[PDB]
Amino acid sequence: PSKFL
Amino acid sequence: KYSFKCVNSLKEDHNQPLFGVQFNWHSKEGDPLVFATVGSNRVTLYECHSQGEIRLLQSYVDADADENFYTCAWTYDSNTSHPLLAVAGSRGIIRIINPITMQCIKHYVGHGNAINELKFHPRDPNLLLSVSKDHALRLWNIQTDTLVAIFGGVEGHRDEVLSADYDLLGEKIMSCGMDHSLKLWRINSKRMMNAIKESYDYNPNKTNRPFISQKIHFPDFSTRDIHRNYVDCVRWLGDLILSKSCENAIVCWKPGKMDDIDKIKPSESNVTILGRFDYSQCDIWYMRFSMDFWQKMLALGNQVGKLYVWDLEVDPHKAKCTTLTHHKCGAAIRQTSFSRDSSILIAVCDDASIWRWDRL
């Protein structure tokens, strides 16, 4: 998934 | 049950995410309430004062312009009794900051990449646990600057380690990471207690031996059956575990069937789920919950600036939740921290903002 939005 | 009010906010001037925050619970009573924040290449100390004031105290800025600190943890200096602050991040170097002078007094190279979390042992303030993008956890003795143990390899994590916690007794560690595994490592064996004793006996001025590290290849229990994706935050609740992934729940579970934690062996095929704490909009990783000193309440921020607080004094199915919002707090909250007396809750954000919530 992603660490950042 | 628990109600808080937002009394103030501040933004740091670097405009980079604040990845970590911790109150110093190792202060002396009487001292002003201090917390540390880490982000960019900075560590900053603040004091909480009356009328909601968040007063800047002092800061350490790493000489490496491209270091990025992710995590910090407080302890005692064994030589003086005063607090110390361990920090680490993208460079994979642990730096021990003396918060008195805001200088780095020790640093530890050894990990193969970024450090994702640091924790101190609950009984022994010299014992620092680090977990790393290199797939390993390390245990250090910061009094003698020794690597006591490396936890990794054959049945170690197979991808970055993201979080870990010691239990209350400091007898065992639960770790978790990108391989959607949780792994239990006991540290109360005869061998491990002897290793810690020897670490204190070591002085490189009186000998040419290096200090021999333990290499622990086999956790005492492992599971991939709690979460499906990256597991980014773990915390013991007595003999139970609280952990979360990117799936909008914190799961409360135990190894074994509904089974003594200390008879658990690596052949244990199963886990028991006791409950879940559901929420929304926390599906990016590296988002950490905290608890108060008594472990009566659990706080987690989400990626839109909402702060959930659960009263755990309950069957977890039944736990009540307070939702704390402010119309100007819209950026992702990375971590929260309660003051030692539970009167203050601080949240830090991706836009470098800091949010102060006081208990009513």
Side-chain angles (χ1 to χ4, degrees), chain A, chain B residues 2-10 12-27 29-50 52-157 159-189 191-196 198-205 207-253 255-256 258-259 261-262 264-268 270-317 319 321-360:
Chain A
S2 177
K3 188 164 177 186
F4 300 106
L5 198 68
Chain B
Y2 296 111
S3 99
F4 291 84
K5 168 164 197 311
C6 186
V7 298
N8 207 359
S9 76
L10 181 147
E12 297 193 358
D13 70 0
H14 56 69
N15 300 134
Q16 303 300 301
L18 286 180
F19 288 124
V21 61
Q22 299 289 345
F23 273 94
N24 183 9
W25 294 357
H26 298 68
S27 56
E29 165 187 323
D31 296 350
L33 297 203
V34 173
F35 63 93
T37 68
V38 289
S40 176
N41 64 344
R42 194 181 297 198
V43 188
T44 309
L45 303 188
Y46 296 92
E47 290 183 342
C48 292
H49 285 286
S50 51
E53 193 197 353
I54 303 171
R55 180 183 301 174
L56 175 62
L57 192 64
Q58 57 202 37
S59 80
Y60 167 89
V61 178
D62 199 280
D64 181 359
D66 293 341
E67 181 49 297
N68 189 5
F69 293 127
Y70 297 172
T71 181
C72 68
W74 296 88
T75 205
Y76 296 118
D77 192 334
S78 65
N79 183 55
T80 70
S81 93
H82 301 302
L84 294 174
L85 181 60
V87 305
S90 60
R91 289 300 197 190
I93 300 167
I94 299 174
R95 297 201 175 281
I96 300 303
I97 306 311
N98 183 346
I100 288 173
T101 63
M102 297 311 274
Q103 297 317 293
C104 183
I105 62 164
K106 302 160 176 281
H107 70 275
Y108 303 111
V109 310
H111 285 284
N113 213 296
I115 294 161
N116 293 317
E117 204 171 40
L118 292 170
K119 291 292 182 65
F120 283 98
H121 191 284
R123 296 278 317 278
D124 191 339
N126 300 312
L127 294 179
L128 178 56
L129 183 69
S130 59
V131 318
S132 174
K133 169 162 178 176
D134 68 11
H135 317 172
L137 302 85
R138 283 182 176 208
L139 183 66
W140 314 79
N141 179 332
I142 66 157
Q143 183 173 296
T144 58
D145 302 324
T146 41
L147 182 60
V148 184
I150 302 162
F151 302 91
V154 179
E155 290 299 345
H157 289 284
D159 199 344
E160 301 199 26
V161 196
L162 293 180
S163 183
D165 194 51
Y166 299 95
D167 79 323
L168 173 59
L169 304 179
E171 292 176 352
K172 53 191 171 290
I173 296 167
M174 193 71 77
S175 62
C176 60
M178 284 188 181
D179 62 0
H180 69 261
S181 188
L182 289 120
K183 293 184 184 282
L184 191 163
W185 315 81
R186 292 185 195 286
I187 57 169
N188 65 332
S189 67
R191 290 181 187 174
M192 192 68 65
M193 300 292 291
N194 156 81
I196 292 163
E198 285 295 340
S199 71
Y200 280 104
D201 295 338
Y202 186 67
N203 171 25
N205 298 339
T207 180
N208 291 140
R209 69 192 165 98
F211 183 70
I212 301 312
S213 53
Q214 317 295 119
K215 270 74 64 170
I216 303 307
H217 285 274
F218 303 103
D220 299 286
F221 171 83
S222 187
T223 184
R224 288 198 293 165
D225 291 351
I226 298 302
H227 306 282
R228 177 60 182 87
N229 209 327
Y230 292 176
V231 188
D232 66 346
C233 189
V234 63
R235 190 82 185 63
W236 288 92
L237 187 65
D239 309 324
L240 305 187
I241 298 93
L242 300 174
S243 63
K244 58 172 284 292
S245 179
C246 300
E247 317 182 296
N248 294 315
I250 291 152
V251 187
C252 178
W253 66 273
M258 200 51 218
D259 283 0
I261 188 62
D262 293 322
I264 293 282
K265 303 310 197 131
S267 48
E268 185 56 61
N270 56 68
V271 293
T272 300
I273 322 289
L274 287 86
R276 227 167 56 196
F277 301 89
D278 308 286
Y279 49 88
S280 308
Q281 297 192 94
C282 191
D283 60 62
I284 55 173
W285 62 270
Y286 213 84
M287 298 283 282
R288 273 57 170 281
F289 60 82
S290 70
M291 300 186 88
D292 63 305
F293 176 89
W294 295 105
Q295 301 192 273
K296 294 170 172 177
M297 70 193 139
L298 169 72
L300 177 72
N302 71 6
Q303 71 214 21
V304 300
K306 289 197 184 150
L307 187 40
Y308 299 98
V309 182
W310 289 269
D311 178 351
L312 305 126
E313 290 294 283
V314 290
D315 186 356
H317 311 318
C321 183
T322 302
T323 296
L324 293 178
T325 56
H326 189 276
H327 61 267
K328 307 286 202 208
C329 185
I333 293 164
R334 292 284 177 181
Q335 194 173 42
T336 60
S337 182
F338 286 96
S339 61
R340 189 188 196 289
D341 74 356
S342 315
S343 60
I344 298 178
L345 173 65
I346 297 283
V348 304
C349 295
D350 271 7
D351 69 342
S353 66
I354 305 172
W355 294 82
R356 187 179 155 177
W357 293 81
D358 287 6
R359 201 145 142 192
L360 282 153

